Design a binder for this molecule. Structure first.
Ligand SMILES: Nc1ncnc2c1ncn2[C@@H]1O[C@H](COP(=O)(O)OP(=O)(O)O)[C@@H](O)[C@H]1O
Length: 364
């Protein structure tokens, strides 16, 4: 069995990754027994304190332990460009809460695609290509998940590629000049190059006819390369569109979150405010599973978690975008103070949610 361990090497570190590889594996033999996903940020060994920010075990270490040691990179006309792994995308993957194994299977699909591409599997005999489509209603994290997926793959494939690239083309819009810069990045075969075309449905809605055909033909060229992956998103979940998108061999529906997911999302927001001490004092909050084990009995330990559970349920229907914005509105409208008890914040969050749906009915 294989266990994955992501090692965040400090930007200021100059040590070889083989040295870090041996240090981290000594640390794991020390602790050796693991209960689940655990992350060390403080170390006793001074070589690790110097060169490693965090060691995270991610989903008894007699399994096969795979280390992924990476450094974050701290820093083209109509395109955004990041060198991967990018500091901007650090923590994005974990901030996206989907139902079980949406992100897992998506990672595995692209992993198999890259494996098949790397071994020159004949696609006439086994179906695969280099295009990925996430489709969903707007605000479900599709663009973020593409970026987070590109970051995960670069980190997980650090043995085959030395770094990654992400080019985000802004659909709202020389075309030869942009794809020349993309080809220069592809020319470096030590790099896994991701090209992200957001909301491709706007292309078929948009003189405008020539620009589209120019981009589709440029896409057809770069996808001929082994180190290229094309990520696309569509905010219309149902409709058919453009060839390379409709023929994408990986299609994933991304819908709005369930009440179970909303609960986790809110929990992550409340944890963050407690970490920053905007919510003070800190209090213990229960997960759904923990609530289910006590049959949802209302007592001092559970009262506030039950209240959050009920806020999550009347939040059903809202997108993730709105959900992670509501704690900001809750604080700005109903707290307006540097500090607030969790009781006060949950009440504020509840009002903010009601306000969202009042605004909704006015649009109806
Ligand atoms: N399922 C989710 N869980 C947590 N946060 C989410 C989720 N979906 C969206 N968000 C938040 O909304 C932000 C913007 O979403 P975005 O990726 O632009 O949506 P889309 O591209 O699908 O329109 C994300 O960066 C994220 O913080």
């Amino acid at each position: 069995p294989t266990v994955h361990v992501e090692v965040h090497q400090r930007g200021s570190s100059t040590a070889k990754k083989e040295d870090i590889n041996l240090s981290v594996r000594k640390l794991l033999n020390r602790h050796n027994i693991v209960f689940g996903d655990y992350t060390w940020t403080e170390f006793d060994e001074p070589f690790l304190t110097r060169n490693v920010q965090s060691v995270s075990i991610i989903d008894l270490s007699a399994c096969t332990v795979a280390l992924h040691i990476f450094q974050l990179n701290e820093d083209i006309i109509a395109a955004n460009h990041w060198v991967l792994p990018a500091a901007e995308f650090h923590g994005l993957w974990d901030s996206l809460v989907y139902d079980v194994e949406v992100k897992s299977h998506l990672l595995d699909y692209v992993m198999t695609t890259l494996l098949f591409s790397d071994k020159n599997v004949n696609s006439n005999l086994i179906t695969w290509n280099r295009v990925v489509l996430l489709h969903g209603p707007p605000g479900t994290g599709k663009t973020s998940l593409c970026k987070a997926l590109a970051q995960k793959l670069t980190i997980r494939l650090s043995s085959r590629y030395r770094y990654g690239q992400l080019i985000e083309i802004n659909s709202h819009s020389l075309v030869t000049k942009m794809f020349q810069k993309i080809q220069d990045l592809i020319d470096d075969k030590d790099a896994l190059v991701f090209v992200l075309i957001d909301a491709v449905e706007s292309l078929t809605a948009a003189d405008a006819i020539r620009v589209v055909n120019a981009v589709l033909t440029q896409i057809d060229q770069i996808k001929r390369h082994s180190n290229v992956v094309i990520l696309t998103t569509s905010n219309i979940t149902e409709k058919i569109d453009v060839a390379f998108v409709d023929r994408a061999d990986i299609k994933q529906y991304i819908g709005p979150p369930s009440a179970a997911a909303i609960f986790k999302i809110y929990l992550s927001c409340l944890e963050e405010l407690m970490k920053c001490q905007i919510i003070y004092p800190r209090q213990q909050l229960l997960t759904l599973r923990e609530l289910e084990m006590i049959g949802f009995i209302e007592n001092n330990v559970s009262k506030l978690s039950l209240l959050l559970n009920d806020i999550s349920r009347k939040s059903e229907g809202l997108s993730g975008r709105v959900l992670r914005k509501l704690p900001f509105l809750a604080h700005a409208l109903y707290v307006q103070a540097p500090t607030v008890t969790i009781e006060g914040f949950l009440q504020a969050l509840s009002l903010a949610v009601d306000k969202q749906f009042e605004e909704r009915k006015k649009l109806a």
